[PDB]
Amino acid sequence: MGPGFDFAQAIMKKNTVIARTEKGEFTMLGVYDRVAVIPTHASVGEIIYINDVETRVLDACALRDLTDTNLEITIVKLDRNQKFRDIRHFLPRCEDDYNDAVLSVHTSKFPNMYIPVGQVTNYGFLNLGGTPTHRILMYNFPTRAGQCGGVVTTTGKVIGIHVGGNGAQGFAAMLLHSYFT
Numbered sequence: 001m002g003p004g005f006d007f008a009q010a011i012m013k014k015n016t017v018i019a020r021t022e023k024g025e026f027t028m029l030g031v032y033d034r035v036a037v038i039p040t041h042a043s044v045g046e047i048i049y050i051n052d053v054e055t056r057v058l059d060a061c062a063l064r065d066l067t068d069t070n071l072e073i074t075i076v077k078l079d080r081n082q083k084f085r086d087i088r089h090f091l092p093r094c095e096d097d098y099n100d101a102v103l104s105v106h107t108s109k110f111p112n113m114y115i116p117v118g119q120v121t122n123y124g125f126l127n128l129g130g131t132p133t134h135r136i137l138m139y140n141f142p143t144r145a146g147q148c149g150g151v152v153t154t155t156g157k158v159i160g161i162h163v164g165g166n167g168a169q170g171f172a173a174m175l176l177h178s179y180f181t
């Protein structure tokens with residue numbers, strides 16, 4: 001409807017795939033080459049389905065900060081025959097707060113879904129499903145089951161991936177440029 005949805009759509013139409021693990025279907029953001037991200041609770045194994053294609057996982061790394069605290073981001077290298085458009089220049093370099101974000105989801109359950117979530121707070125620490133987690137962004141939208149892996153964008157930046165909610169608030173893990181050097 002406006003420039004927020006325009007940037008979100010541009011990311012969804014070229015830089016997402018539908019990922020299926022034994023723990024469900026997730027929106028999966030492709031970042032560059034054959035490297036993508038997914039929430040760590042997806043429990044990626046040696047094989048994953050990518051748009052319903054059986055795909056070998058060449059590498060998977062669950063990120064933690066230098067306090068050895070969960071970040072809830074897994075970086076996956078896929079044995080896919082095609083590269084993603086390189087979007088690393090849209091990633092923030094530092095932890096920050098944001099105005100006027102969009103959460104965008106694409107699965108079998110929720111195709112072509114875009115949610116204007118509004119103001120995004122650098123929340124920091126969250127006990128996420130019992131696991132201490134750092135670098136959490138919060139937005140005041142009642143997000144639901146099926147939105148995990150959803151991409152959070154502002155005009156010009158890709159800032160996080162949706163990892164949870166409490167029925168009133170939604171929570172994303174930060175994406176930082178330094179994760180993809």
Ligand SMILES: CC(=O)N1C[C@H](CO)[C@H](c2ccccc2)C1
Pocket residue numbers: 047053054055056057078079080081
């Ligand atoms: C990962 C990928 O897409 N590849 C295609 C090929 C055979 O269809 C290999 C494979 C390896 C393991 C499972 C499925 C496929 C690698």
